[PDB]
């Protein structure tokens, strides 16, 4: 199923993060299915807490970053999306490597959207499950 | 009305982010009342999204960073807190200066804690309100 | 702090629940301040979980019930609100009497709103903290 | 696979609700799978808001009700689960019939669990998506030296 309303390439996406938070974290997308969007992120002196574990906020940064663009790719023309509510359950820690976020839609309405982003570690072990609720602004 | 079970100094506390995400982002705790813990964060290239505004994940990184430490200061001995769930509602954007997050407890149990982190802009306007649920581990 | 764009009395307000869940759970509005709405609900056979304590879901029905109407009162004309997301933390259980829900705004925009509802037991202690995000419909 | 640690019949599962909220909203567990639990709820005057539609709070009642027991079934002995926090997205309304809740585990930790409950209408359309985080409370007698 194709949910995307706009067309884009990993090239353009990754370009977005340069100059802002997304950039200074090395978050790079790596897939764009018909109804799915993936991305990864490291685990170092930028995405870790004072104990050397994948910071929970880092996972949310990753979740929101992907959900935001994905929601955008589901709109038309001058439309835009703004994240309203986000939540996440940290069910497993991470200390090294890169985590991959898999974003899928739970609901794509005309005025708002709900995105689910599951984050897994290199071994494929689920570390975080988050949801993003956005509003479509004309 | 005094909740802390571990005495700490802003100096030693701020020291926490000396090589981890909390440092790279310039988060600096500035207050330690009987039941509240504050800390500001810079709204710059490091914490902004592709459009120049504060990134929603930055708001959550701040929340979860202030909540993790508040929770820890409320345990004793070898105990530790692990973040379980976090939720945030972005009610207002911010594009300049420093955002302040005021953390207070909603509940301080013996097994779990619930923290409320309200993030304001330099104008004192709520920008993000979030809750962090922690688990106390022996 | 007069947030209400509409006018309504406790009498008219409570008459909304007759014949629906609100009236069936005996949820009763008891205060309309300039920027807050308060309502009580019994902790009984209709609101308890299998072990004699207040069902967490009942606390959420109270929360959404107060937040929905409050949202309405903050619009006007043919405008109406629709709940998008609601979350809550159960921090203390209630076993008897009635709990009291207190709702106040966190954001009232032209497109959506965020409401915070705190639920207390008969002793004035926090039992549930929740947030509701609505969307305004023209 | 089999996540359940306790063996319960649907009959015994539904008997738990008599006399309380679950029984009063006619919430009926109708299926226990290897790693899923399902319950139904009528969309009527007891569960509708003033405008004649399914009350979002009811949906959360259904979700927490299913999630709570699923969490209990995944604990042995006198152990127990306590609901910590819940969240839900209302993505579509309902006005008649029943809605069905389908609870799957997202995490079955040693100290806490995360449950996902999706509520569907008659046509299999998602009306509410919810997550419940619970804490496991230890229980049972302990050996002591003598």
From Swiss-Prot, chains A, B, C:
Outcome of substituting residue 64 to A/Q: Loss of activity with benzoyl-CoA as substrate
Observed effect of gene inactivation: Deletion results in a significant decrease in menaquinone production.
Alphabetized CDD domains for the sequence: PaaI_thioesterase
Variant or mutagenesis effect after changing residue 64 to D: Almost loss of activity with benzoyl-CoA as substrate
UniProt superkingdom: Bacteria
Alphabetical UniProt keywords: Hydrolase, Menaquinone biosynthesis
Residue ranges the record marks as coiled coil: none
Keyword Hydrolase in annotation: yes
Record note on what altering residue 92 to A does: 9-fold decrease in catalytic efficiency toward benzoyl-CoA
Catalytic residues in the record: 64
Residue positions binding substrate: 83, 90-93, 107-112
Chemical reaction(s) catalysed: 1,4-dihydroxy-2-naphthoyl-CoA + H2O = 1,4-dihydroxy-2-naphthoate + CoA + H(+)
Pathway(s) this gene product operates in, as recorded in its UniProt entry: Quinol/quinone metabolism; 1,4-dihydroxy-2-naphthoate biosynthesis; 1,4-dihydroxy-2-naphthoate from chorismate: step 7/7; Quinol/quinone metabolism; menaquinone biosynthesis
Any one of the GO BP annotations: menaquinone biosynthetic process
E.C. no: 3.1.2.28
Effect of residue 69 to M: 10-fold decrease in catalytic efficiency toward lauroyl-CoA. Does not affect catalytic efficiency toward 1,4-dihydroxy-2-naphthoyl-CoA and benzoyl-CoA
Disulfide pairings: none
Gene Ontology CC terms, in alphabetical order: cytosol
Phenotype upon changing residue 68 to A: Almost no change in catalytic efficiency toward benzoyl-CoA
Function of the protein: Catalyzes the hydrolysis of 1,4-dihydroxy-2-naphthoyl-CoA (DHNA-CoA) to 1,4-dihydroxy-2-naphthoate (DHNA). Also shows significant activity toward a wide range of acyl-CoA thioesters, and minimal activity toward benzoyl-holoEntB.
NCBIfam families (UniProt xref): PRK10293.1, unchar_dom_1
Quaternary organization: Homotetramer. Dimer of dimers.
Database matches in HAMAP family: MenI
Family (UniProt): Belongs to the thioesterase PaaI family.
Name assigned to this protein: 1,4-dihydroxy-2-naphthoyl-CoA hydrolase
UniProt organism field: Escherichia coli (strain K12)
Curated annotation (Swiss-Prot), chain D:
Outcome after substituting residue 55 to F: Almost loss of activity with benzoyl-CoA as substrate
Signal peptide residues on this chain, from the entry's feature table: none
Changes seen on gene knockout: Deletion results in a significant decrease in menaquinone production.
Keyword Hydrolase: yes
Hydrolase keyword on record: yes
Keywords: Hydrolase, Menaquinone biosynthesis
Effect on the protein of changing residue 68 to A: Almost no change in catalytic efficiency toward benzoyl-CoA
Effect seen on changing residue 65 to A: Almost no change in catalytic efficiency toward benzoyl-CoA
UniProt similarity note: Belongs to the thioesterase PaaI family.
Name of this protein: 1,4-dihydroxy-2-naphthoyl-CoA hydrolase
Organism: Escherichia coli (strain K12)
